[model samples]
Structure formats: C-alpha cells, structure tokens
Target: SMSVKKPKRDDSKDLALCSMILTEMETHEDAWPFLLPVNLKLVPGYKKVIKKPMDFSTIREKLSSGQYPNLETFALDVRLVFDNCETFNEDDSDIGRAGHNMRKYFEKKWTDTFK
Candidate 1:
C-alpha cells in the first residue's frame, strides 16, 4: 500500500486583512465598492471567512504577532490584496474614488506606520 500525504494548513492572516478592508470601508461609512470588491476566493482558507472591521491597532497587533516570517513578505501580502482591485477607476464615481483612496491609505500605513 502507498501512503498519501496531506496538504499543509494555510495562512488566514491575508483573509483577515481582506475582511478588515471590507469593514474598514464600513467604518468610514463609505459605500462598499460594489464595482471592485476584494476577491478573497483567490486566497486559501478565505472562501468562507467572515468580514470584520480591522483598525490600526488590530493591524499593528497582527504585524507584530510574528504571523509572517518577515516584514517584506508581509508587506507584499498586504499589497496583493489591494492589487485585486487594480481595475477600479478613481474618476468614474465616488465609490471608485473611495476605493482608490482606501488602497492608498493602506499602502501609506504600511510604508509610513508599519515601520
């Protein structure tokens, strides 16, 4: 008989971050970007995940939690989430602009505050 190997557990941090994005939009009371929502289906362990608000404190906590081996990869992961919405046009509608601004905010926080 041959032995079978099982797949390893995947990270949920990205999913959590994506969920935070959704809730962050809600926190700002901005309309959810129906035109360009983050597609978490592209990430593992995130298919059935629930959306939740993630504040700076929560993000800082997660960043310092050592969930990731290093900051570069962590930053890359964060960027990838926003990249999913690259097709959003900032000029078409308020929602589009909001989406653009939100991505900028997250990127700035990562570069400016995550240090």
Candidate 2:
C-alpha cells in the first residue's frame, strides 16, 4: 500500500528569502533605502532619522507588561520587519493586522486587508 507522503518542507526557499532581507539591511546606507530602491523627500525631522528592526523579545516583554511604544516608532519597526519577510502571505496569518499597524512598513496605506 502506497501512502501519499505530505510535501517535505524545504527550508531553502524561506532561507533564501531571509538572506535577501539580511543583505538588504546590511547594505543599505539608510533604512529608507530598504523601503524602496529610489529616494524621496522626507519631512525635516524624519530626514536624520535611522530605523532599526524591532527585537521580538523586547516587544514581547512590553506587550506582556501592557506597555506600548509611541505610535510612530512602533509603526516604523513593524514596517521594517514586515518588509524583510518576502515570503510572507498575510492571508495565511494573523499578522495582517500588524502589517496594517505599520503603514511605513509596506510604503503603502495600511488597509483592512492588512488589518
């Protein structure tokens, strides 16, 4: 009797996508470059800013304690992490909401699809 074997999961695709993200972060002169290949005029105060990806553990601690970051920074970090994941399918996870929370993350208006 031949039993159908479930598709063997391959880490290759996911890993390759991850590598692209790491490379993008490592090579970008600024976080904005990761958002797009071209440059755009930013607001004055935003010009000198540099963004860093969120550390999940820190975020987890904050959430556990009922603490939250300011809306802007929280949005920025969410965007960065979301952009880093190329293989992410929002429909597949609850993360669509977080992606909505970070409009900067996708360089697009956050919508209910992401929400």
- Candidate 2 lDDT score relative to the true structure: 0.39
Count of backbone collisions within predicted model 2: 2
Candidate 2 residue lDDT tens string, 1-115: 2796878655334333433433444344433323442121643323234234343344434434546433344344545555533223353444444434343433432332123
For model 1, residues 1-115, the per-residue Cα lDDT tens digits are 2687677545545545544553554355443543233456664534444233223344445555755564565555545444433433435667567656766776665554334
Off by over 4 Å in 1: 1-26, 30-67, 88-95
TM-score of each: 0.38, 0.24
- Model 2: how far is 63 from its true place, Å? 4.2
RMSD of 2: 15.3
**After aligning candidate 2 to the native by TM-score, how far in Å is the CA of 95 from where it should be?**
12
Question: What C-alpha lDDT values do all the predictions have?
Answer: 0.49, 0.39
Look at candidate 1 and tell me the lDDT of residue 16. Answer: 56
